[PDB]
Amino acid sequence: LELQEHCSLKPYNTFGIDVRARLLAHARDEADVREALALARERGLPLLVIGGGSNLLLTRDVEALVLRMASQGRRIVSDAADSVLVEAEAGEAWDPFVQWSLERGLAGLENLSLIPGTVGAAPMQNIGAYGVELKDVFDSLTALDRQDGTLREFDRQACRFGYRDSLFKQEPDRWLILRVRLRLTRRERLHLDYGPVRQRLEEEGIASPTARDVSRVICAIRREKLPDPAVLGNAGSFFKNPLVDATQAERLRQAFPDLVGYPQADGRLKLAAGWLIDKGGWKGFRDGPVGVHAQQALVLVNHGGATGAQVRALAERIQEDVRRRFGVELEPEPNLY
Numbered sequence: 001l002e003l004q005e006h007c008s009l010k011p012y013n014t015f016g017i018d019v020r021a022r023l024l025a026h027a028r029d030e031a032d033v034r035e036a037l038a039l040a041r042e043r044g045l046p047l048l049v050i051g052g053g054s055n056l057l058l059t060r061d062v063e064a065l066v067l068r069m070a071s072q073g074r075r076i077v078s079d080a081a082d083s084v085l086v087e088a089e090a091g092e093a094w095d096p097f098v099q100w101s102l103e104r105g106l107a108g109l110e111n112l113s114l115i116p117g118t119v120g121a122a123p124m125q126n127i128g129a130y131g132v133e134l135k136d137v138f139d140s141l142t143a144l145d146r147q148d149g150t151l152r153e154f155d156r157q158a159c160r161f162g163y164r165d166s167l168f169k170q171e172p173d174r175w176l177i178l179r180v181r182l183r184l185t186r187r188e189r190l191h192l193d194y195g196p197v198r199q200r201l202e203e204e205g206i207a208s209p210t211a212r213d214v215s216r217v218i219c220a221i222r223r224e225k226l227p228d229p230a231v232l233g234n235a236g237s238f239f240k241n242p243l244v245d246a247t248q249a250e251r252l253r254q255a256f257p258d259l260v261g262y263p264q265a266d267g268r269l270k271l272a273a274g275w276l277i278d279k280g281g282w283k284g285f286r287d288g289p290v291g292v293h294a295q296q297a298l299v300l301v302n303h304g305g306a307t308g309a310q311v312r313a314l315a316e317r318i319q320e321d322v323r324r325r326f327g328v329e330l331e332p333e334p335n336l337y
């Protein structure tokens with residue numbers, strides 16, 4: 001289990017927060033998972049599940065058994081020609097899993113290229129980028145019920161996916177995701193809305209891009225645009241794009257013509273949270289070891305040595321400021337512990 005007592009979690013979270021865990025364990029299959037659960041209950045410690053720690057804000061030492069999800073395995077479950085059911089263990093790194101699928105001639109994940117973290121965590125916040133969400137390709141997952149240690153299958157409906165949401169984020173600490181099955185395709189027409197990805201592919205002379213072509217562009221753009229936690233600690237975008245009803249939307253639009261929004265299919269307008277933050281004057285803000293990125297206004301950052309409490313406090317000031325200015329509450333994307 002590679003059990004360690006009073007272990008620094010600093011290399012295990014992309015924010016780079018240095019808090020200690022009472023017990024740190026690395027799980028490399030379901031047996032290790034069941035063992036750690038027995039251990040946590042034996043020692044009367046809660047169990048905190050961690051993947052790549054890239055959606056995690058740790059604010060204090062962790063009096064719990066921290067289980068690092070490191071199980072390995074990727075496989076084609078069944079080939080149906082135009083679609084292919086693939087399966088990966090929870091501890092599989094997400095982006096190497098995307099590449100594994102693309103090397104196999106499968107499409108569906110290319111817009112989710114270069115997202116950090118693990119396969120296991122991906123259903124929890126319904127990972128999404130470039131107009132694609134995990135739920136678009138999701139077939140099923142196997143999860144351990146942490147109430148009674150049974151195994152349950154969740155199909156797409158049972159997962160109650162939502163924008164950066166899922167049953168598992170709503171019922172926290174209840175389900176331990178062990179492996180995830182996705183339906184990828186071959187020979188589908190690549191649907192790409194106007195934007196920088198499509199523009200770069202046109203520049204490369206590519207009017208019918210393969211999934212691999214799309215993935216190469218999106219990797220390049222993300223490596224150009226998004227701070228790397230390796231250099232500057234962060235958990236990606238800190239806030240979700242908030243929705244407003246047509247009432248608040250027309251009022252905010254009357255107060256700001258430059259208001260960057262997205263009209264939804266249900267009639268509401270999803271606001272661009274980075275615009276709220278930028279126009280709050282927050283872009284590039286720094287306060288000691290924490291700050292907001294000078295260009296990606298959604299990315300709160302640890303310049304080095306920050307505590308999670310310092311990050312949370314900065315997030316709270318931005319939230320309160322945006323509340324006080326725009327009448328809009330920014331929800332966080334990372335999970336705070």
Ligand SMILES: Cc1cc2nc3c(=O)[nH]c(=O)nc-3n(C[C@H](O)[C@H](O)[C@H](O)COP(=O)(O)OP(=O)(O)OC[C@H]3O[C@@H](n4cnc5c(N)ncnc54)[C@H](O)[C@@H]3O)c2cc1C
Nearest residue numbers: 049051052053054055056117118120121127128177235236
């Ligand atoms: C630079 C950077 C860029 C990012 N870009 C995006 C993006 O474009 N789109 C997007 O959606 N997200 C993005 N993220 C957020 C993060 O990468 C995703 O949310 C990812 O799915 C988190 O996976 P993880 O393994 O690191 O989860 P962790 O951070 O390790 O865990 C996050 C939550 O999931 C729980 N959890 C983890 N594994 C399991 C498991 N097997 N079973 C049950 N619960 C579990 C954890 O308890 C925790 O609550 C980015 C993060 C960073 C640092």
Ligand SMILES: O=C(O)c1cnn(-c2ccccc2)c1C(F)(F)F
Nearest residue numbers: 128129130131226236237296298299
């Ligand atoms: O929608 C997208 O296409 C997209 C493209 N990059 N990032 C992004 C990811 C992490 C930090 C900041 C931005 C997004 C998203 F997270 F906002 F979702």
